[PDB]
Amino acid sequence: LRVYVTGNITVDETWSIPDIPKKGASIHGVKVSQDIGGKGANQAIILSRCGIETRLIAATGNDSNGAWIRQQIKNEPLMLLPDGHFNQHSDTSIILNSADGDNAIITTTAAADTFSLDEMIPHMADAVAGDILLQQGNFSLDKTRALFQYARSRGMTTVFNPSPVNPDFCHLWPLIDIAVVNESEAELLQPYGVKTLVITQGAAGAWLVQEGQRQFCPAVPAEALDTTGAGDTFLAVMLASALLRGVAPDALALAHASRAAAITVSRRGTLSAFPGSRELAALLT
Amino acid sequence: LRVYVTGNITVDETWSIPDIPKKGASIHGVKVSQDIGGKGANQAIILSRCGIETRLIAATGNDSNGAWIRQQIKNEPLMLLPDGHFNQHSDTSIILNSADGDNAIITTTAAADTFSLDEMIPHMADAVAGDILLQQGNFSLDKTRALFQYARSRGMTTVFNPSPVNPDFCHLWPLIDIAVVNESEAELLQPYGVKTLVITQGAAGAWLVQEGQRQFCPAVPAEALDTTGAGDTFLAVMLASALLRGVAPDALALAHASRAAAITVSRRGTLSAFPGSRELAALLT
């Protein structure tokens, strides 16, 4: 079984501030970390580091960030398509880390947007029934839906993590096999009729909803000095643990994702904070 | 007569978002513009366009924004020091919202905060009595004072524009020959004993004070398209005018500066908005 991930790849830049500015206000911040990231990239890489045959379809620009990104992906057991880049700035993210509550992130999409659907599906031409298409919320409702529709014509399994959230993603669920959502997204998009529903609540554990049954997997306690990437780690490892053992997302899968995620939040950065290929294998056994 | 401008250099990035995200949110944004900023670089840059031998002593780090700054400066007749760079520098995120009125702003320094003496001072080894030391508000009190004393220690004319304003800058007046200040800075800070005092009031004109004389110079009425850099355009052209005619800042120096600032404010941005060398030569004549 091969996992195709259609998303984005970025360079996350984290800013430490007192609290997020109110329009009109000017404040001081400190840039504390630069790292490779992106919803699509994070999940694909972690998946591949778990041993799952994985392919990432995302656009990089003819940026110095572009060379940086492509160079890093080269050290991962993941295939990144296309080989070439685009003359656009590579997508980037501004992660506002305030003294108070949880982070706020702003991500550009110039590169991902240029990467048309026509240039995209050809990279999935070698897909077979049973293969998986994993998407996040980096695309428009139309591009996002087109991709899932395509996946269903090729007999693939569909996984959806609607982050960032798009109000219109709400009438997309009938096309999904596995939905992974926040409490915010769970309410704002209202998942329904999905074989497997997973609602993540960060440090407050996670829910697995299947066939009417509800199971709660409490989170593994951890020192959270950097929260970026926890959700992506939790999802990639939950999915990996099911795929390896050959079952459907189950309680042990969440048990593993919770452990993988605790390692991630205990480290600075994005790509640089993810559990190593060996730590994951030790974890998954 | 040469001008040494001890200050900062920045990259100001304008991001367009639908609205400022709340703490836990994750939104899409568009990185629309990027300009070189910093009252230090702005002032030094405009002075050099006026034909004044100018040296900007500011620090840039080892990141994308650093290489870009180093690259954009090559286009100005300005000389930037030191050569080479340091690590992760000053720049600001200008969050331009939608419906939601005014822009929120986050700024970082770090490059300036760490640009120690010993690092700056040797760059004025060629300075002589008569040369000018222009300094803004981007540096601690001890660092700023130390610079003015070194200057006052070689016959250099000291020019001060305490912005960002620090309340303790209140003790430096004896070391300053020319003070350029706005309303709020004039009150609180309360400059005294300065041989030349300029109080900026933007559209409301400017005052030239000391040696008894109180001279007011009305502004060029019109209305800002983009107020950015009006102040440092005013300070720089004023200095240049007096410098070119070999006198202390006078009435004519203020009218030229007022004419220049009108130009800057009618165009968007900084480097591409300020008056060009030929435009400066024309109004300065």
Identify the CATH number of the domain in which residue A276 sits.
3.40.1190.20
CB-based contact B15 A94, cutoff 8 Å: yes
Distance from CA of A35 to the nearest CA of B (A): 12
Sign of CA dihedral A24, A25, A28, A30: negative
Separation CA A144–CA A135 (nearest Å): 8
Q: What amino acid positions of B are annotated as catalytic residues?
A: 232
Count each helix (H run) and each strand (E run) in chain B, helices first: 8, 14
- Whole-number Cα distances in Å, B83 to B57, B61, B79, B178: 10, 11, 10, 29
The total number of structural domains that make up chain B: 1
B218 touches chain A (CB under 8 A): no
Query: B21 preceded by cis ω (within 30°)?
Result: no
Read off the DSSP letter of residue A120.
H
B67 touches chain A (CB under 8 A): yes
Longest dimension (CA), chain B: 59
Q: Which residues of A touch B88 (CB under 8 A)?
A: 31, 34
A278 touches chain B (CB under 8 A): no
The experimental method is X-ray
Which 3 state secondary structure label does DSSP give A252?
helix
How many CB pairs below 8 A link A and B? Answer: 105
List the single residue in B with minimal CA-CA distance to A97: B23
CB neighbour list of residue A106: distance below 8 Å, 6 or more residues apart: A93, A94, A96, B15, B17, B21, B26, B27, B28, B29
**Known binding positions of B:** 10-12, 38-42, 182, 200-205, 226, 228, 231-232, 264, 267, 269
Range of the domain at A188: 1-285
Which residue type is seen at A219? A
Separation CA B181–CA A263 (nearest Å): 52
Paired strand residues for A17: A98
Are the C-beta atoms of residues B35 and B264 closer than 8 Å to each other? Answer: no
Residue B181 has which token pair? 């200040």
Separation CA B207–CA B201 (nearest Å): 8
Are the C-beta atoms of residues A135 and A176 closer than 8 Å to each other? Answer: no
CB-based contact A65 B64, cutoff 8 Å: yes
